[PDB]
Symmetry: C3
Subunit: 334 residues, 3 copies
């Protein structure tokens, strides 16, 4: 029935984002994506704690999907026989059928194809939601990502001016609930099913053991620091499918911020810290003015420094002494 | 002194809302309401857990009161002799005397009459606040509701256009603190006074045992699902008198949202999830586009699925395959 | 290199704010501040619980610094030899070097001088951030305050009209983590270092033992209540460097509120309760209409009434019976 051009996208692992246009002269298309679910035991911290993860495409978060307003998003969801549980997908960008969840429940060995029209602009969470108590469990096990639906004219500041990013990163934040044994050590489990009873008991107490970006403590640091140059405008998409977060770029700002994540609303300007409601994605852009290391955190600093929720940027360029200078280096008090 | 027409309102139990006009040609009136406090032991979950509730008019939340800007709200608060505690009422819509609390403290066997002028538009919490540590206790025992103060011209989108709802529902969310015994079972108590010591100890640890809509797990489901038809614009007022919430309509959106709840501010558009600050009411309107079941949740999914905070909508009408379609039903992977 | 006039400021302890202009005819200056770090054991509640505090200038919060857009803020940070730990300072208002933290690490016996240009308007947190797990620890030990960067034309409502406050107060909210012994009593420690292991274990569980304004339960009450008169427009700056808060003026409103705290954005109007994201400052102004006592709280009422987070205003003037009146005093039910 729907006679539009088809375009395939090759998804890439976070924090990177598949190539796309901001402003476009294309009209509506059917944009084709494939997500393959993977249940796997992973390491989540530098001490070697393990975790029974459930993922879209092998990553936490799932990859960022990018389309334009009025596109149709056609997703093939694949649940290989090597998995143990049923799964589905719910897109907060989509209208009807519990976001798609009611049309995409697949057992191991099955796949399904869902199409939805991208009628709402912004960044949006997608997540698994099989039913009942399985809903939180699959989400906090890692089965969540985001989609970005851009205006065809690209982003604007609300005030007729264009807002073009030089690069975009997707930071997915994951609250994790790893039980401890009597000794106080984190437990390991042989299967997601075996982790379930202890994990649910902990979940209901609402305090995570770990809060991480890109699936692990330190994931977005070292060789895998985010990067920029002085003068570059960087868009940072941040999602949290279950729990609030308060992003902050240490040493920078949010020049233009859509904390509720929806481009029909003008961005706020000049923020220190913004707020991502659990169950949402938001976005912030910043033009870097100074070189050096930045930390990108949730500004519950206990979560940031002690539970895992810190990324770094390494920024190249020339130091600006007008903006900041060390007038007198540390010295003995006179 | 005040020579205005008087109008009585017959309050109705949530989630329903007493009949009212949006835009009105009436001028200011004295609008008369009566609230009768009821302390009662209630069942809060499907397992039969009991709870020492304290309520306005017998319900959690208390009923929604609806007036227009510049009306005078005259409330008779009644504390029958069958109750055990003093109570009062604080309206966040009102100016002075701790919202009215300092003028409405009544012992069992007493009533009081308070009038306040509705100078601020929006949805607002009202709650009991007797003094000191009793304040949180009475609120988290159920003594809270909301009032809506509409502009005389009805609602608008900020952008000169009218926003008329076909129906309004009031979802009051309640964080509850039910202690457990050594065995791990929820405790039952013979009186609110007897529940107090254990309940306060738990309260101070800040983690609820239950988070419910309309006073009980599953209250707004089954026969008591909320309803709509495709094409209907529904306003959802959400309050939380003590703790944050993040509402989300699964399969829908917030087309126009006042998350801080105040109509002097333009609504935001096209939200996935919004945020109700503890101690406030907010409001979201959505025009339904697809039939079927929706879930309305707080998008801490642990709270939603495991602690009680899920409502349903059942929506009638014609499925829209342009907006969403199952291109290929579940099938074996090729 | 920088040839501008220099102006010294004498900082004053919170909740008060050093004298400053709103609108100004001055051009950019170098504004000179000195902060001297003090580690000290303090009493935090009316029961005599003690706490190993770490402070800027001896207070929790640190003092409010006020400048105008385009000023250069030159801070001498002093860490006397009587302290035990290294410290630094990070300004969320500043651009580069982790907000200044990477240029201001000083051992006991040292001082440092940092200058930053005030390119972003609003209220902003400043805090210590030595590195790693020390970051949260120093912040939740009290090492945080705020700076306000005003437009040179003063504040406006977004809608070309000026917003002039008659007085400003700074309310700094502190989440504190005091461990308990087996008996259930709060522990006391001989040094910050000795408090660290128990305090970190508690911190990671994310639930504070105390949430206070101005460093202690009841600090902003009694003789130290905030004050106003009917007709006065009061600006309330609220900061929280680590954890969310939801301010509310009981019996009043936020007439104009910048909850994200940044003056490049128009204020919202007529709020009941607003939201301060952990890691930020916000500001609300209210013109008092009624005399009497008000409470200023976070509207998690458990935190407010039971954990410490209540201030009072005592307001002088004439009661307005049009806005509110007790129509019938408490009486026996007919
Ligand atoms: O940034 C969105 C915000 O900007 C306004 C103008 O104040 O509208 C701009 O953005 C719309 C969505 O991209 C465009 O359709 C419109 O043409 C453009 O002016 C606001 O209406 C909107 O909330
Ligand atoms: O929706 C409120 C928002 O709309 C504006 C226009 O942008 O004002 C409209 O709403 C006011 C309150 O109902 C009316 O008094 C006004 O006439 C109407 O234009 C904004 O000023 C306001 O924040
Ligand atoms: O209150 C800030 C808000 O107001 C607007 C006008 O709607 O701009 C005013 O404030 C700016 C910052 O102080 C001034 O530069 C400007 O001249 C004045 O109109 C908005 O643009 C801004 O977001
Ligand atoms: O799943 N390991 O690459
Ligand atoms: O800005 N530091 O958390
Ligand atoms: O109070 N029972 O209907
Ligand atoms: O949209 N589901 O939580
Ligand atoms: O430090 N005592 O004043
Ligand atoms: O308005 N009282 O919390
Ligand atoms: Cu799943
Ligand atoms: Cu969801
Ligand atoms: Cu009561
Ligand atoms: Cu209140
Ligand atoms: Cu320090
Ligand atoms: Cu910070």
């Amino acid at each position: 029935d729907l006679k539009l051009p088809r375009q395939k996208v090759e998804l890439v692992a976070p924090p990177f984002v598949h190539a796309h246009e901001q402003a476009t002269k294309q009209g509506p298309k059917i944009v084709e994506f494939k997500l393959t679910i993977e249940e796997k035991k992973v390491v989540i911290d530098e001490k070697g704690t393990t975790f029974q993860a459930m993922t879209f495409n092998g990553s936490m978060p799932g990859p960022l999907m990018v389309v334009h307003e009025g596109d149709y998003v056609e997703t093939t969801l694949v649940n290989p026989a090597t998995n143990t549980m049923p799964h589905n997908i719910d897109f907060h960008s989509a209208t009807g059928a519990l976001g798609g969840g009611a049309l995409t429940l697949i057992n191991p060995g099955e796949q399904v194809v869902l199409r939805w029209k991208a009628t709402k602009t912004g960044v949006f969470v997608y997540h698994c939601a099989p039913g009942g108590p399985m809903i939180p469990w699959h989400v906090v096990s890692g089965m969540n990502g985001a989609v970005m639906v851009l205006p065809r004219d690209g982003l604007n500041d609300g005030k007729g001016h264009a807002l073009k990013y030089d690069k975009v990163y997707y930071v997915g934040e994951q609250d994790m609930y790893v039980p401890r044994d009597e000794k106080g050590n984190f437990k390991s489990y042989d299967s997601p099913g075996e982790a379930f009873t202890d994990t649910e008991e902990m979940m209901k107490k609402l305090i995570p053991s770990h809060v991480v970006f890109n699936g692990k403590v330190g994931a977005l640091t070292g060789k895998n620091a985010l990067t920029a140059n002085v003068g570059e405008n960087v868009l940072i998409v941040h999602s949290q499918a279950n729990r609030d977060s308060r992003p902050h770029l240490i040493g920078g700002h949010g020049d233009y911020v859509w904390e509720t994540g929806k481009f029909g609303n003008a961005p706020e300007v000049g923020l220190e810290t913004w707020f991502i409601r659990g169950g949402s994605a938001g976005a912030a852009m910043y033009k870097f003015m100074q070189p050096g290391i930045y930390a990108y955190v949730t500004h519950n600093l206990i979560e940031a420094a002690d539970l895992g929720a810190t990324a770094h940027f390494k920024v190249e360029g020339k130091w600006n002494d007008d903006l900041m200078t060390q007038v007198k280096a540390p010295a003995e008090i006179p």
